[PDB]
Amino acid sequence: QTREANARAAVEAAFEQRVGAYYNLKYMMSGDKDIAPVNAWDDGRFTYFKFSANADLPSIYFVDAEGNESLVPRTTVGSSNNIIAVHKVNPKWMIRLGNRALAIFNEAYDPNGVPNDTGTASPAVRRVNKGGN
Amino acid sequence: LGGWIDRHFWERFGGAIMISLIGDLGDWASRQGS
């Protein structure tokens, strides 16, 4: 039990530590700027859209090479729940709220990305096979 | 929740419309025997 609590403390520390990330900020938009984020960037693994405090949070969709939109899983982060993290890096996105639509473009798309060798969202934490069997 | 409604007009009425029209056309041809 002692090593488990120590492991949990170290895991929280490593998740919070946040070293060695590059940030893409070459994001552009066209469409209905009323539902637009104030900031968009990515860290190579997730894509973040910051919305202001007086803005409704829209729905964000994955646009593929042919124009088709599809669902992407979503996390809402930030102290005031103002950031939407989608779990993918993509060259094109679509933001929809009601009948308003906004296109987001990744103007610095990196097809290679950075591999996920650990199983987690951070390179400093590893997901290990507990179940044995 | 509401949106756009497909009422399936053709799937509901096309069979009857087509059967009626083909019957009428066959009748017209049979009349055109003379």
Binding site: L25, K33, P37, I83, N99, A101, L102 | -
Partner: peptide, 28 residues
């Protein structure tokens, strides 16, 4: 003869940067 409509497609004319200032979550 009639199919379900598509959602609005955004206009591709007023293309502008999203970021007018660097976010502070990037620590900047």
């Amino acid at each position: 003869c009639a199919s379900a409509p598509k959602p609005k497609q955004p206009s591709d004319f007023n293309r502008e940067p999203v970021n007018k200032t660097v976010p502070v979550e990037i620590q900047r």
